[PDB]
Amino acid sequence: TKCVFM
Amino acid sequence: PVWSEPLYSLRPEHARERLQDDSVETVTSIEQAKVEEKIQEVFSSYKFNHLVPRLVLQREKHFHYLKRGLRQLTDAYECLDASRPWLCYWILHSLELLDEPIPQIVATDVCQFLELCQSPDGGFGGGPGQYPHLAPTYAAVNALCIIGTEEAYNVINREKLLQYLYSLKQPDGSFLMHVGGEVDVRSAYCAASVASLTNIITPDLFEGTAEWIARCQNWEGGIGGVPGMEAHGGYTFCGLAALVILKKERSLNLKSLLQWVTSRQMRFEGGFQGRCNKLVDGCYSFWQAGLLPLLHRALHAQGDPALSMSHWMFHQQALQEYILMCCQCPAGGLLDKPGKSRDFYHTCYCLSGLSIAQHFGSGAMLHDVVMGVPENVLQPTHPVYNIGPDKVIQATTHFLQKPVPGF
Amino acid sequence: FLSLDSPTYVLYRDRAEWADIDPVPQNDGPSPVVQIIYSEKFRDVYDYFRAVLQRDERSERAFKLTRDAIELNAANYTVWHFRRVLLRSLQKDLQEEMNYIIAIIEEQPKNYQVWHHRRVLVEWLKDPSQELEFIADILNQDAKNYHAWQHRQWVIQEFRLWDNELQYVDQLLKEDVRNNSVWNQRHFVISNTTGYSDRAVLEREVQYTLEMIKLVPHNESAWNYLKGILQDRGLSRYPNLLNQLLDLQPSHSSPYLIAFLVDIYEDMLENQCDNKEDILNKALELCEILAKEKDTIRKEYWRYIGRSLQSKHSRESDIPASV
Ligand SMILES: CC(C)=CCC/C(C)=C/CC/C(C)=C/CONC(=O)CP(=O)(O)O
Ligand SMILES: [Zn+2]
């Protein structure tokens, strides 16, 4: 999983 | 004493910090419980293995991971094909934190690459040929400032950059993220950051921006993406940092903000969650904990006399324990939590957070807390820009020689 | 036509109908940094996307190509922009496009571009008829999806669709009373409809929250909501609150209840209450219990609160240095 920031 | 455990997370009393679900199970409690069980295993590992705990920041491993990534990435990074300046920033900053020098071959190549990402109309895109966007623009500027050479600084086309910011500015004080794009608090921060560093802030550029940001603070005390939304650490950091740049922190209810952020630190895990009732995550070691240095400076500027002179208003020790014991990948790189795969974003933020937790600085007063081996100490980071304080000073000073575009 | 995942999918460089166009390789420079070793499929689609974007070819084939570019990297905002240019120039059916965006969001719901695109479509069509139900479906899979909740607030506000939201909030709170996104939505609905000044509404809300606190005393959301809706007017403005919280101390204690008591004391002290001193000491006593026993993770905060209260409410606080 990844953290979205844009 | 001999029976005394120096690590906060391993003390017997610590087990009392486990979740109490009141025998009412919901998706939230079940998820929280799963994380706590996994974290408990990590904590108890030394004990069940009959070894003395030694908290070591795997520098050599992190350096290898970063050094290579700065040059080439696997297709695992295809999802970040529109965020390459971020990859430059996360990597360069992690290296700076680890006190690794940036070879001039590297620095020049990063500069040329960022020039290619720069739009003819101002701002930087996610890669060559992509339309400009405030997030990649913020990252590009930060990366060039970390390099901090005359070449790096000269890459930024200031007149166009200013024109770009104006083209995104809204009547209500907010900014679009890019032409035809969305609006949220990240844009206010991205714009304030790049505009302050490059000295392009005109009298009216941020008209209404502070007020718009203040409307994002909600009943929780924190700040949401847009007015009405749930408070979140990512957006709260953006909101407060932007206000700090604009010297308008006072527009917020700082007391409710401070109460909200301090409550985001997980009693058991020691790290921070992004919003109430969600899970702990290593990147919030920066977004959330980074608010404390900002709050300290703001409250102190109001002459708050009760402010500590040696610590931030969070458990610095527990955060460091969480990061060092739970967020390091053996192969290099850092992560969200045990079970998650490493990535450059979490590598940048877990380290930025570790640095903040290790260094307290209120003007003349200075006090460090370095958990584990002393080699674990990182270089300090500026709580507003998340780049070295020296790079910030260096950049602003250089850009103050130039006049604000237009005059 | 040809899905990015069909077993018979073919690279664009091997497609006859694309023979006239020369792909445009990515310009990374002489010696690249953060260079991504893209797969064949990825690089092929993007080389062709670069070609059409550069020529500004506003065609049907270019349109179909953006769908593939998007599936390969839905975060590519440049592709989304070009797709919207094509939707207008080619006069494409926007409901067909709505069907497409709902499918994409279903598969990648934590992306900024997909939600912004859906919003533009709704704005263009001036039709919110499918929104609340669509969002409800996404929220049924992740009840805390931030973009989903944000889009939901936008739709509700812009189209004045307030009528059934509190009912929706009640339903989700029943499923997971610990869902902070739902408590935030609850506040959003109420503040934009009846407001909290209406004494009947405020009363109802507090009864409800205290009731939830009794069922799950450790759920921090209910505690934050209660403080959230009362703190602006002043916690001391509600004298019965204190007495009633104390009544939960036995079988419903939590560091949350203790913290609330300190907040009530803090405000009482701020509004010159009776027994100034008795109150201050009660507060400092709790701040210490919290910092040293019941909420040590926040020891630095609690020490600071204790120090602030001391700094401005001790009997000595208004006394000149000479006395
Ligand atoms: C300058 C920039 C670009 C700062 C970004 C700050 C962040 C990280 C903002 C968060 C944006 C966001 C999508 C929040 C909600 O979605 N995130 C999650 O669901 C993760 P969690 O469960 O931890 O909230
Ligand atoms: Zn994260």
Give the CATH class of B1-407: mainly alpha
Is B175 in a helix, a strand, or coil?
A: strand
User: And the tokens for C312?
Assistant: 């401005």
Ramachandran class of C275: left when φ > 0, alpha when ψ lies in -120 to 50, beta otherwise = left
CA distance B263 to B399: 39
CA distance B386 to B234: 13
Instruction: List the domain boundaries for chain B.
Output: 1-407
CA distance C224 to B262: 13
Experimental method: X-ray
Chain A environment of C112 (Cβ under 8 Å):
4, 6
Count other C-beta atoms under 10 Å from residue C275's C-beta.
Answer: 10
CA of C190 vs chain A CAs: smallest distance (Å): 30
CA of A4 vs chain C CAs: smallest distance (Å): 7
CA distance B168 to B190: 12
Q: Give the one of B133, B186, B283 whose C-beta lies nearest to A3's C-beta.
A: B283
C291 in Cβ contact with C306 (< 8 Å) = yes
Return all residues near B390 (Cβ < 8 A) that are at least 6 apart: none
CA distance B186 to B170: 14
Chain C, 178 to 197: residues with Cβ < 8 Å from chain B are 178-181, 184, 187-188
Breaks in chain B after (C-N > 2.5 angstroms): none
User: And the tokens for B394?
Assistant: 């260096």
Q: How many domains does chain C have?
A: 1
Element (H, E) at B360: strand B359-362
Domain extent for C73: 1-323
Tell me, what CATH number does C270's domain have? 1.25.40.120
Is the dihedral angle over the CA atoms B28, B29, B32, B37 positive or is it negative? negative
DSSP state of B183: B
Strand partners, B73: C36
Interface of C with A (CB under 8 A): 75, 110-112
This PDB structure is determined at a resolution in Å of: 2.2
Chain B, 228 to 247: residues with Cβ < 8 Å from chain C are 228-232
**Phi, psi (deg, nearest 5) at residue C217:** -50, -20
Find, among C55, C57, C41, the residue nearest to C5 by Cα: C41
Count other C-beta atoms under 10 Å from residue B308's C-beta.
Answer: 16
CA of B358 vs chain C CAs: smallest distance (Å): 15
C229 lies within 8 A of chain B by CB: yes
CA distance C298 to B272: 12
Q: Give the one of B22, B70, B73 whose C-beta lies nearest to C216's C-beta.
A: B22
Kindly determine whether residue A6 and residue C112, on different chains, have CB atoms separated by under 8 Å.
yes
Q: At what angle do helices C165-175 and C131-141 cross, to 10 degrees?
A: 10
- Identify the nearest ligand to the CA of B192 by its number: 1
